[PDB]
Design a protein around this ligand. Structure first.
Ligand SMILES: N[C@@H](CCC(=O)N[C@@H](CS)C(=O)NCC(=O)O)C(=O)O
Ligand SMILES: N[C@@H](CCC(=O)N[C@@H](CS)C(=O)NCC(=O)O)C(=O)O
Lengths: 252, 250
């Protein structure tokens, strides 16, 4: 106290990649905790923990271990109601997962195949082999990463328009949590925080309306999403035949 | 004023509510524990039935407070009656609700609107048919005549259920969208299906659709609020050899 251990999933730059670990970091600062970060990558997770977990994030409040970012979030609300609440209620949880799933299908799905080689290259040296064969065979490929990430210049322009349903919401609220952010924002923001960690070329345009909520979210808690290894999410340059990245409209 | 709140309805010929905005208002009102003085009527004459106060329903009249727009009504009920069960649990629900509702209207209402627009028309009040005809043809282009839009729904309807899977995924891990008890999130989502049921003269879903559990319990809420004599079964869609699989069975 006032510290909680956090088993991180970091790239070679020490920059967090896992959105599950991202929203946990955010969930902890939201609660006003200090984070004792345990650095580590994809490989050797089970050994870093006391043989307690094959996945991260994992927190160790005092001595109590807590696995799974969602459980951890629910745990922080459980044991610390005095601190700023992560969940607004049961209805947020259900509606969150709907938005979360939608962001994973719409943003993570494409961007994953657009940054999988960068994802691999930016990883710690000890992870590169593991990340190589597992990702390109299970999720999958079926062939190698260089072949999947190839042609991303053509794929990336098609993602921004599909995000419009999410732009529609943020156009009428500062945060998903209302006037202040909560786990809804951090859960959704994790998507872009992960993207920013592996995007060696920006997936969004400069003037994307998402940027307001994004820059604000990344700036939260003394720039929690402003790690040195974080790449810019904005800077995508489109062609004549590309779709409009977002609805340019105003506004009664 | 006893326990009664007046509600200007949008009814079909059978007296069954069609508008999803009115549906979620009914549910929101019953959820608050209010009795509803239903002012019947249809698409035509809304200005006349109201005090020239609105051209659109739902509209409630609490004591003397006229409240317009289903969303504003729900918030008004939460604002004025915090002692009665809440409709929203806070700002976060509202924002994520809008996202879900938007997805439901893009995924369910849109396709089903085209597939049931002639039934929609045929089921409306006789003094509304031509208006609904003239209105929906010049506006929701859709387009050609109502017949041409609904034409070939037998090919279009089987394509909708699979796209509803992202919604089933949530309901497979919760009793209601609002936890153990439903709220406006449930009612708002249910309204899409309440609207469909009021006009669907052929079932859009299969008998075994995982949504059925949440839907039936939802339609049954508040003394069968969604079980008006005019409703049609949402379930009974007969799939053919070529039709896709309507839902994940895992
Ligand atoms: N149950 C975890 C999911 C953990 C997880 O899937 N982590 C990924 C990062 S995206 C990972 O570590 N993959 C490699 C591994 O399993 O070791 C949560 O939701 O918090
Ligand atoms: N502002 C209302 C929407 C009202 C509305 O769009 N009503 C439709 C029913 S789908 C209607 O009556 N359309 C024909 C008309 O305006 O008379 C709300 O969101 O609650």
């Amino acid at each position: 106290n006032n510290t909680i251990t956090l088993y991180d999933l970091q790239l070679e730059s020490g920059c967090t990649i896992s959105p599950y670990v991202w929203r946990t970091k955010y969930a902890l600062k939201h609660k006003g905790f200090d984070i004792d970060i345990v650095p580590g990558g994809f490989t050797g997770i089970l050994e870093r923990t006391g043989g307690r977990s094959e996945r991260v994030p994992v927190i160790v409040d005092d001595g109590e271990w807590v696995l799974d970012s969602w459980v951890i979030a629910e745990y922080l609300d459980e044991k610390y109601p005095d601190r700023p609440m992560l969940f607004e209620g049961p209805t947020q949880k259900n509606l969150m997962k709907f938005l979360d799933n939608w962001l994973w299908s719409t943003a993570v799905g494409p961007w994953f195949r657009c940054y999988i080689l960068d994802y691999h290259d930016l990883s710690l040296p000890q992870d590169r082999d593991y990340v190589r064969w597992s990702r390109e065979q299970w999720f999958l490929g079926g062939q190698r990463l260089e072949d999947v990430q190839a042609g991303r210049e053509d794929r990336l322009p098609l993602v921004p328009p599909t995000l419009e349903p999410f732009r529609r919401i943020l156009a009428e609220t500062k945060w998903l949590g209302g006037d202040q952010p909560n786990f809804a924002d951090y859960s959704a923001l994790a998507v872009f925080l992960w993207t920013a960690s592996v995007a060696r070329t920006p997936p969004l345009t400069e003037d994307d309306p998402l940027r307001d909520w994004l820059d604000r979210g990344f700036d939260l808690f003394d720039g929690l999403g402003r790690h040195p290894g974080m790449n810019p999410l904005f800077g995508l340059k489109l062609r004549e035949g590309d779709p409009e990245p977002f609805v340019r409209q105003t506004g009664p």
